[PDB]
Design a protein around this ligand. Structure first.
Ligand SMILES: C[C@H](CCCC(C)(C)O)[C@H]1CC[C@H]2[C@@H]3CC=C4C[C@@H](O)CC[C@]4(C)[C@H]3CC[C@]12C
Ligand SMILES: *[C@@H]1O[C@H](CO)[C@@H](O[C@@H]2O[C@H](CO)[C@@H](O)[C@H](O)[C@H]2NC(C)=O)[C@H](O)[C@H]1NC(C)=O
Ligand SMILES: *[C@@H]1O[C@H](CO)[C@@H](O)[C@H](O)[C@H]1NC(C)=O
Length: 225
């Protein structure tokens, strides 16, 4: 198991940070991050909780959830797969299987002058099936108190032009003013030059996320009607 990053480094733009390049093994998460990991990425919350992210990154992930929540909160299955796409990118102890750093630049600690390295861009190998299921679980979600589709607000285009792969490409493009840096997705259900795409199990909008979380409504999920 190997990482491509660990912890936050320099400012990209606005209040947004690059992560620090790191190619060692995952590290057990400090106990002070257990609430965050339980909340955001409970799939990782077992054993030594050895991850390729630190507490700062998890806090940043939480803070950035506002806009997806803004439009997708009412359909938990839809939001769940999206959260997992981000959890895997941020924290997976097997990052190196599906992430490849493609651009970097120096980070200098202002006090010590010790150099680290910003991960400026990377490529993320995303399962084709994963991407399609993530889209499928979200494509009927209505924007709250409207008759329009929520994806029209998260895709940088109208819902009739939004598709699984262009949705993920848009979200991952820093030109959107939310993503701190660009992640270039590659979609494949097959290995690609030795890379094993992230193809985590997904939940449909007709399924419960867990014992305390019901399926989505008919209004947001035509399957359950
Ligand atoms: C919340 C948005 C999605 C919605 C974007 C928009 C413009 C439609 O609202 C997503 C897209 C990219 C995501 C980040 C990817 C990488 C990281 C690095 C990790 O260390 C910390 C989490 C973070 C910042 C993700 C947060 C969620 C982001 C912005
Ligand atoms: C992505 O899928 C993997 C594989 O199913 C998940 O890792 C498993 O998580 C469960 C739940 O804690 C553990 O019981 C298994 O031991 C894990 N298996 C492996 C191979 O690590 C992972 O949780 C999923 N990712 C997220 C973010 O939910
Ligand atoms: C998802 O795909 C299923 C078939 O697997 C289909 O019934 C459904 O219309 C699709 N859309 C949604 C919103 O679930």
């Amino acid at each position: 198991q190997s990482c491509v990053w660990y912890g936050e480094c320099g400012i990209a733009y606005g209040d947004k940070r690059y992560n620090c390049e790191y190619s060692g093994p995952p590290k057990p998460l400090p106990k002070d991050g257990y609430d965050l990991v339980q909340e955001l990425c409970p799939g990782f919350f077992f054993g030594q909780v050895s991850l390729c992210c630190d507490v700062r990154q998890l806090q940043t992930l939480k803070d950035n959830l506002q806009l997806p929540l803004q439009f997708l909160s009412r359909c938990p299955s839809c939001f769940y797969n999206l959260l997992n796409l981000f959890c895997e990118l941020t924290c997976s102890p097997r990052q190196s299987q599906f992430l490849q750093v493609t651009a970097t630049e120096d980070y200098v600690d202002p006090v010590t002058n010790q150099t680290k390295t910003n991960v400026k861009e990377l490529q993320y190998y995303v399962g084709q099936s994963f991407a399609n299921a993530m889209y499928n679980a979200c494509r009927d979600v209505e924007a709250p108190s409207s008759n329009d589709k929520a994806l029209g607000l998260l895709c940088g285009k109208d819902a009739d032009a939004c598709q699984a792969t262009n949705w993920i490409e848009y979200m991952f493009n820093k030109d959107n003013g939310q993503a701190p840096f660009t992640i270039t997705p590659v979609f494949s259900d097959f290995p690609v030059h030795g890379m094993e795409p992230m193809n985590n199990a997904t939940k449909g909008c007709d399924e419960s996320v867990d014992e305390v979380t019901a399926p989505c409504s008919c209004q947001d999920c035509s399957i359950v009607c």
